[PDB]
Amino acid sequence: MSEESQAFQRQLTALIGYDVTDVSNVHDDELEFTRRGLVTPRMAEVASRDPKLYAMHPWVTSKPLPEYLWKKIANNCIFIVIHRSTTSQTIKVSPDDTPGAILQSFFTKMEQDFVLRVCGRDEYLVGETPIKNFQWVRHCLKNGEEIHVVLDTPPDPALDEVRKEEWLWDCDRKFRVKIRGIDIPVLDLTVFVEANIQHGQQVLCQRRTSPKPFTEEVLWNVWLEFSIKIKDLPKGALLNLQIYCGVRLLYYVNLLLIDHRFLLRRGEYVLHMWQISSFNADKLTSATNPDKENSMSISILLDNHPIALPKHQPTDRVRAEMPNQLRKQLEAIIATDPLNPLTAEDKELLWHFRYESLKHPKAYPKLFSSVKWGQQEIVAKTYQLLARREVWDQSALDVGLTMQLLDCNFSDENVRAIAVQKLESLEDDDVLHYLLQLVQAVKFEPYHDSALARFLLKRGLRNKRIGHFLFWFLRSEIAQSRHYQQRFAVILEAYLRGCGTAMLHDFTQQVQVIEMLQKVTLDIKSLSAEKYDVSSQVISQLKQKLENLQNSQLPESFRVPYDPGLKAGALAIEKCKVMASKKKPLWLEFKCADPTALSNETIGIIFKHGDDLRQDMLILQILRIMESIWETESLDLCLLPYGCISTGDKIGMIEIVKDATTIAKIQQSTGAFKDEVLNHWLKEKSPTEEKFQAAVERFVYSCAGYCVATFVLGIGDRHNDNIMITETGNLFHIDFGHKERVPFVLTPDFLFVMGTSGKKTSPHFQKFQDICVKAYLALRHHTNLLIILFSMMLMTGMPLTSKEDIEYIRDALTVGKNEEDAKKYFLDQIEVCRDKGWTVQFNWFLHLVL
Numbered sequence: 001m002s003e004e005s006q007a008f009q010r011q012l013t014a015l016i017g018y019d020v021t022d023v024s025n026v027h028d029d030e031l032e033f034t035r036r037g038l039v040t041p042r043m044a045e046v047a048s049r050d051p052k053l054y055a056m057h058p059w060v061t062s063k064p065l066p067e068y069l070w071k072k073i074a075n076n077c078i079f080i081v082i083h084r085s086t087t088s089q090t091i092k093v094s095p096d097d098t099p100g101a102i103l104q105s106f107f108t109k110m111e112q113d114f115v116l117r118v119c120g121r122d123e124y125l126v127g128e129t130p131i132k133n134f135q136w137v138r139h140c141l142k143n144g145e146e147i148h149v150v151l152d153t154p155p156d157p158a159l160d161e162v163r164k165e166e167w168l169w170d171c172d173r174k175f176r177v178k179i180r181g182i183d184i185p186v187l188d189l190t191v192f193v194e195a196n197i198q199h200g201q202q203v204l205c206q207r208r209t210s211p212k213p214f215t216e217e218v219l220w221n222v223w224l225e226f227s228i229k230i231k232d233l234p235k236g237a238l239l240n241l242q243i244y245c246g247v248r249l250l251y252y253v254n255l256l257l258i259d260h261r262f263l264l265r266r267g268e269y270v271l272h273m274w275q276i277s278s279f280n281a282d283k284l285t286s287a288t289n290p291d292k293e294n295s296m297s298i299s300i301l302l303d304n305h306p307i308a309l310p311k312h313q314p315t316d317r318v319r320a321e322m323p324n325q326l327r328k329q330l331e332a333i334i335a336t337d338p339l340n341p342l343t344a345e346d347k348e349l350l351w352h353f354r355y356e357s358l359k360h361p362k363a364y365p366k367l368f369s370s371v372k373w374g375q376q377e378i379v380a381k382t383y384q385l386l387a388r389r390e391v392w393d394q395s396a397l398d399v400g401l402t403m404q405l406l407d408c409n410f411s412d413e414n415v416r417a418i419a420v421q422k423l424e425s426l427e428d429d430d431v432l433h434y435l436l437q438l439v440q441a442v443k444f445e446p447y448h449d450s451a452l453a454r455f456l457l458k459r460g461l462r463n464k465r466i467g468h469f470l471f472w473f474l475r476s477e478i479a480q481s482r483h484y485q486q487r488f489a490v491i492l493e494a495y496l497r498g499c500g501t502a503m504l505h506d507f508t509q510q511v512q513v514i515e516m517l518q519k520v521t522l523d524i525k526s527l528s529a530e531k532y533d534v535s536s537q538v539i540s541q542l543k544q545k546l547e548n549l550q551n552s553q554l555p556e557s558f559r560v561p562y563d564p565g566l567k568a569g570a571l572a573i574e575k576c577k578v579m580a581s582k583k584k585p586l587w588l589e590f591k592c593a594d595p596t597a598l599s600n601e602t603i604g605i606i607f608k609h610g611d612d613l614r615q616d617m618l619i620l621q622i623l624r625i626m627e628s629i630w631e632t633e634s635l636d637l638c639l640l641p642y643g644c645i646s647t648g649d650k651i652g653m654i655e656i657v658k659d660a661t662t663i664a665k666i667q668q669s670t671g672a673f674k675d676e677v678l679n680h681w682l683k684e685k686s687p688t689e690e691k692f693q694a695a696v697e698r699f700v701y702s703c704a705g706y707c708v709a710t711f712v713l714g715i716g717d718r719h720n721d722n723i724m725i726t727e728t729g730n731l732f733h734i735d736f737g738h739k740e741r742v743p744f745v746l747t748p749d750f751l752f753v754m755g756t757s758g759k760k761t762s763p764h765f766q767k768f769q770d771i772c773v774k775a776y777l778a779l780r781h782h783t784n785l786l787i788i789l790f791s792m793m794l795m796t797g798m799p800l801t802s803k804e805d806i807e808y809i810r811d812a813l814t815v816g817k818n819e820e821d822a823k824k825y826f827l828d829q830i831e832v833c834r835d836k837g838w839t840v841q842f843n844w845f846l847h848l849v850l
């Protein structure tokens with residue numbers, strides 16, 4: 001009974017990597033209160049989700065086929081191949097044809113319960129969408145391939161079954177907190193404590209303490225009194241205790257003043273605080289350190305029969321005209337970039353004229369940053385403002401903006417909630433583009449249960465794909481983030497309890513696999529020095545240990561975390577080789593458990609341990625965004641954002657791109673380089689000089705995409721050790737752990753392929769200057785969306801600290817200039833790489849000296 005639940009919770013705890021029943025690290029029931037809250041939205045979505053479509057999770061889009069995918073048209077005819085057993089029959093189809101409409105034309109060209117499954121994958125060509133609007137199809141086209149499909153039985157919705165779940169204002173006293181003392185084990189200095197009252201990163205009030213000698217224990221007993229009445233404390237307000245050294249910041253911890261029940265905080269607390277190895281998302285956490293045996297502590301008293309916060313209640317339609325030169329200043333402000341700080345006057349002006357600012361949704365981020373949140377009366381005037389959301393509600397979703405209201409500068413439930421309301425109108429296609437961000441954006445939420453959380457949860461349970469990646473993006477944080485694992489765990493359990501028995505069995509297999517393969521790598525790296533190269537007594541112990549796990553542990557087949565349609569199966573021991581890198585990665589390879597697989601190409605995975613893979617993920621998920629932004633302007637820069645998921649602490653997986661070789665291995669075929677080796681290698685891997693020319697094309701595109709991209713994200717200056725290229729001309733970076741500086745890697749060996757030397761030009765290189773600016777300006781259009789993604793990436797991924805760090809992308813997009821001053825700028829930079837050729841490429845080699 002409650003024994004088939006303690007084996008289930010035993011199941012769920014394993015899948016998660018955190019025991020959501022553990023209270024060994026909390027001073028209230030917010031995490032639990034939240035486990036309980038989320039039951040409804042789960043159950044609503046499980047309740048409402050359609051069984052057939054959920055099982056087939058058709059991956060479609062409601063976008064317009066780009067100009068370029070039309071030029072592969074073939075006179076309004078797309079050919080689709082079907083296979084029942086050994087059979088197969090091409091079939092002309094219209095792009096606007098549906099799936100149903102196509103079994104109709106097929107049954108009569110050659111008992112209604114057959115769905116077109118894709119050959120080799122668990123991807124389904126079903127439902128009421130033009131087949132031109134399926135992503136699997138738009139893919140085969142982009143890549144010039146052959147839409148293979150096998151007619152067979154619709155998968156059973158009974159497998160997606162789910163187990164039924166068993167389960168005032170007006171106190172004028174200035175607010176005080178008594179700092180009793182600090183206590184730490186192994187600590188000769190001087191040290192005080194700083195008590196900030198925070199709200200979305202701004203300090204409402206701050207009162208420090210008397211410095212004192214740095215011993216293992218330090219008392220004070222002070223009553224600390226702040227300037228701020230207890231009526232003006234805003235819901236979400238943080239009491240933030242920090243501890244400085246003499247000067248430098250060394251410890252922090254945080255406590256919500258208003259709890260989840262709206263009650264204020266009364267009482268005695270002993271808070272375990274986080275140590276520091278400037279803005280960072282771990283500085284905002286309400287979580288306390290769980291390593292109570294080593295971490296600094298702190299004790300404090302909240303005197304405060306209990307005082308509680310009232311949920312505002314809706315209640316001035318008078319209108320006056322606005323001078324010209326004021327509305328000039330308003331509209332000027334509202335136009336500026338997110339990263340533009342507001343002067344106190346810009347603020348008084350924005351707030352003063354708040355009803356005219358409400359008309360431009362683009363002024364919402366700047367305006368809700370103009371609120372004295374330390375002022376009970378202001379704050380309400382604000383609630384009454386968000387009640388007049390006629391224009392917001394009607395506004396076309398703008399994601400740059402929505403995001404902005406979910407970053408660290410906004411900590412007010414009502415604001416954030418309107419951003420989320422806008423997220424609702426996103427088709428699942430777009431949710432996947434931004435899911436990682438909108439999972440990271442949960443770090444800036446003040447309370448565990450939030451509307452953002454309930455949105456990730458709805459959307460994830462409604463579509464299986466999103467589901468899958470929601471699992472791994474969450475499991476990735478829970479495992480390497482002590483500041484947020486407890487919050488994310490409550491959420492992931494929430495999702496798991498509604499995804500179906502079908503996917504539990506699947507995540508159970510992916511995790512076990514990853515669980516073993518973690519093991520092998522560790523064992524294997526502990527035999528080779530960060531110095532040592534690759535031993536053959538090692539190559540014997542690898543194929544020893546895989547031969548082993550293959551001959552027992554690894555299940556017949558598991559789904560591929562970075563690409564879940566694909567089922568991998570049996571190991572290709574022969575191909576599996578530890579790689580040369582100092583951090584000793586595992587080049588792996590599997591056959592595809594799917595009998596209907598067209599090719600024999602294997603599934604190629606690179607288990608790495610030694611570094612945090614979450615920084616690769618963020619960078620990639622942005623490039624995938626840049627592409628979709630090059631699709632809305634009919635542009636395709638052939639990027640290769642390889643799959644790369646993080647699975648646990650400092651270890652994850654990467655996708656191996658078939659038949660691709662670095663630049664460096666191309667050159668070393670005493671650090672010199674030669675130009676012709678580019679082409680020589682291309683022509684050698686182009687059977688015909690026809691395919692050779694297709695290849696030189698990718699190279700112009702790909703090379704150009706990756707130079708714009710890399711320039712923007714400030715990661716252009718790489719070493720050819722870290723650039724690669726497929727046999728078919730496609731160029732792309734790897735390893736994102738990122739004297740004379742180069743804006744990006746455009747070394748003379750590329751130019752050569754473009755057919756140029758020293759200071760010349762050619763039919764390709766003029767093209768390449770052509771495409772680049774098309775691609776650059778295209779981004780400049782979406783400046784705001786990119787700044788806010790960049791900013792949020794630093795704060796939730798690159799321990800980022802500096803506000804000047806972001807003032808970068810500002811300049812790199814060169815804001816507030818016309819499409820000319822820019823196109824120059826860029827093409828100026830294209831040139832700087834010419835005036836430098838290899839000098840820097842050479843230095844990444846000579847570096848091994850300094």
Ligand SMILES: O=C(Nc1ccncc1)Nc1ccc(-c2nc(N3CCOCC3)c3cnn(C4CCN(C(=O)c5cccnc5)CC4)c3n2)cc1
Nearest residue numbers: 580581611612613615654655656657664665734735736737
């Ligand atoms: O680290 C990180 N993240 C990180 C996060 C946080 N903080 C630090 C680092 N992420 C990462 C690192 C490396 C790779 C990668 N992905 C490959 N793919 C095979 C083809 O589909 C694409 C992937 C290959 C193929 N080869 N490699 C290298 C092996 C080691 N290398 C050499 O031994 C070497 C040296 C000199 C000249 N040639 C080779 C250099 C070449 C690859 N590395 C991928 C991801």
